[PDB]
Amino acid sequence: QCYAEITGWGKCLPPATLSNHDLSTFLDTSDEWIQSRTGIEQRRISHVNTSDLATVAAQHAIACAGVSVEEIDLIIVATCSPDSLIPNIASRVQQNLGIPSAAAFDLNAAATGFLYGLETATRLMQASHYRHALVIGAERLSFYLDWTKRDTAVLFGDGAGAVVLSKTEQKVGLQDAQIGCDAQGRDILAVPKFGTAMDRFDADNGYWAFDFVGKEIFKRAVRGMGAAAQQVLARSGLSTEEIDVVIPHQANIRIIQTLCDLAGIAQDKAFVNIHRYGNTSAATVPIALCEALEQGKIKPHDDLLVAAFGAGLTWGAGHIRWGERITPLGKSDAQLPSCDHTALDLLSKAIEHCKRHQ
Amino acid sequence: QCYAEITGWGKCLPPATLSNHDLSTFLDTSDEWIQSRTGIEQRRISHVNTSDLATVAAQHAIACAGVSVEEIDLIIVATCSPDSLIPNIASRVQQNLGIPSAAAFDLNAAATGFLYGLETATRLMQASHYRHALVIGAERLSFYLDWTKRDTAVLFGDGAGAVVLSKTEQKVGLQDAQIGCDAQGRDILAVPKFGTAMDRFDADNGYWAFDFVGKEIFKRAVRGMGAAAQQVLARSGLSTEEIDVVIPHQANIRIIQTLCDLAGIAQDKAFVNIHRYGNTSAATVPIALCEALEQGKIKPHDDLLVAAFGAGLTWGAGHIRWGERITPLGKSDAQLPSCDHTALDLLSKAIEHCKRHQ
Ligand code: NA
Ligand code: NA
Secondary structure, eight states, rough: OOEEEEEEEEEEOOOOOHHHHHHTSSSOOOHHHHHHHHOEEEOOSSSSOHHHHEEEHHHHHHHHTTTTTTTTTEEEEEEEOOOSSSSHHHHHHHHHHHHOSOOEEEEOGGGHHHHHHHHHHHHHHHHSOOOOEEEEHHHHGGGGGGTTTTHHTBBBBBEEEEEEEEEESOOOOOEEEEEEOOOOTSEEEEEETSSSTTTTTOOOTOOOOOOOOOHHHHHHHHHHHHHHHHHHHHHHOOGGGGOOOEEESOOOOHHHHHHHHHTTGEEEEBBOHHHOOBBBBGGGGHHHHHHHHTTOOOOOOOOEEEEEGGGGGGEEEEEEEOOOOSSSOOOOOOOOOOOOSSSHHHHHHHHHHHHOOO | EEEEEEEEEEEEESSEEHHHHHHHTTTSSSSHHHHHHOOOOOOEEOOHHHHHHHHHHHHHHHHTOOOOTEEEEEEEESSOOOOBBOOOSSSHHHHHHOSSOOOEEEOOGGGGGGHHHHHHHHHHHHHSSOEEEEEEEEGGGGOOOOOHHHHTTTTTEEEEEEEEEEEESSSOOOEEEEEEOOOGTOOOOOOOTTTTTTTOTTTTOOOOOOOEEEHHHHHHHHHHHHHHHHHHHHHHHHOOGOOOOEOOOOSOOHHHHOOOHHTEEEOGGBOOHHHHHHHHHGGGGHHHHHHHTTTTTTOTTTTTEEEEEEEGGGGEEEEEEEEEOOOOSOOOOOOOOOOOOOOOHHHHHHHHHHHHHH
16 A cells, blocks of 8 residues: 655745736726625736746745656646647646656646646556656636626636655555535536637637626535535544644635534634635645645644535545655745736736727 | 456547548648548548537447446546536536536546546546546547648547446456656647637637647657557566557557557557548547447457557557456437538638638
8 A cells, every 4th residue: 555645845826916906996896895705815917828837836846845857757737727728738847847758637627626636646656656746736717807797807816836746655645535526516617618619710709708606606615525525534534623734725715614614623724825816726725735834834744634626516625644744855946937017917908808898 | 456447438420521522622632632641531520519529428338338327436538629628528528417426527638638537547446436437538629720731631530439437356447557748749739829828819819820740740659659558568468469459549540550560569450440530639549449349359358458649749558458248238329419511511610711811
């Protein structure tokens, strides 16, 4: 019996920051309206492609683990906002970092995608030859947004987080997990007309709907994550009080609170950074994990509960048993290219087109 | 030790057929030019979305295996042409078929994606709780093509293939596999400007380049598949002559022939259907497997070698040990919706725009 220890962690938040005040200059919103409704104060807007965010997060995780490019046998990029479909963007991260031969694929399960990727990499390593893996959640959600619709435009942001996993005989890393999907929730969170469903030669094809039915998402998310977390805990043999830290998807602080309340988990165990970055889909969990470690929230031998949901409606939970080390082996100097524009300036073309079309 | 037997197989080829003669009515080609160069006589053009092709193939595989919707715990759709990015299309197949709760994700590794999906599902089943899985390769490549460029427009088509896997103690299904990626080949097969790299509000954004460097693809494909097949065989303990059937990606018959020649595998062991369907990316292997079974090419207890490559440049090989049954348990009556248009008529808008832009 083998395990996949989380030996490296890293993040990449692009520098250009879009404040609530910035949003209020082109939408009928206020900092007060956005913060009360969402708990978000800021979010990041990338000046580079998704794959560039993924690359920097990966570099940080690699330095954190001290692994070489030869040692990496598997790369998974969890994303719903890839630069390209042909080829995938895991191969772009691979090209950028000069990693030979590793399997490289993109995994799409919306914001549950990092958890799906962690589950997938862990089992691949347990059942076959893979010695180390790189699992990245990376998104440029700002690509998708309808800048005339305040209820969705204020929720989402860009960023990436990564881990490195290393094979070990010690009982650490992801233990049990339950991942799933409530396909009866498929239509309540969706961009149905970006993809091959869209008309390639319709001049109005950029003005797609971003469907978001908040009350239904809340209900299905709490149900799906809750039952997954229960299945994992029940199988683990831990009592609820033995969970030390919760690392949740960052969609909505009230969902996190309801999840913990219904499970009987103390509210102060859940790591929250939604106020800084908004909902970055697949990136939420790995950024939160990296920052929890940075901030001293996770101790050696802690039990972590990971919980996430996303469009699909995908869902999942996982139990991680931490090992000995909570400190990076090395730091990376890796940085994104210079950002020469403010967030408002980055978004200008899209905002202007969305308004004109309206 | 558990295994993932292939208990169901199925396919969906959309009915609208684009002949070489059809292509010669709008391109500077002839049936003679296309056939001599490519070995392709026909290909299919879908009148429906990728997810609809995936659904029908899945229905056939499900009837073939006799599994219920409750029994299915995992759905992977291997595709580079999904209807949507938010949500994924595995969740659409799940919705269409009323499969509760199963994990559902899209996997992008270009034409090697079905093999990646088979590897992934098999190891998930071996290392954790998943009892049955649905793995689908499905593509609508016709969405992407530059109808003014004869060297690429004649190569690609649409379709889907599926398998059902079932957990067993018997040593059957995928045994060893080696999947990988030569990221030095990333730029020789690519559509860099469909995805979030594209300008959403550029009116010319539909007129993207389809990069295809044939000689370089050939070289890297033979190298990558060849070495993967060798690693699998060497680890298997089989001699080369003990491989009964080869199920290869259908990109180019000369690649298949070179692969077998260099490995010392008899040419008549490789199943070929490229003449009927062209290159359907992730769908090639599962359609070929389904048709090999249909046509009596695979016997109980055969050793199969699967080999594939795709944009990335992704690559892989796998050894499958067949079990007892090569016959479906049941047939499905599932059909696509009525196709009211010829292939030429389906493509008319895109051809006309590509020509006008030129
Ligand atoms: Na504990
Ligand atoms: Na044999």
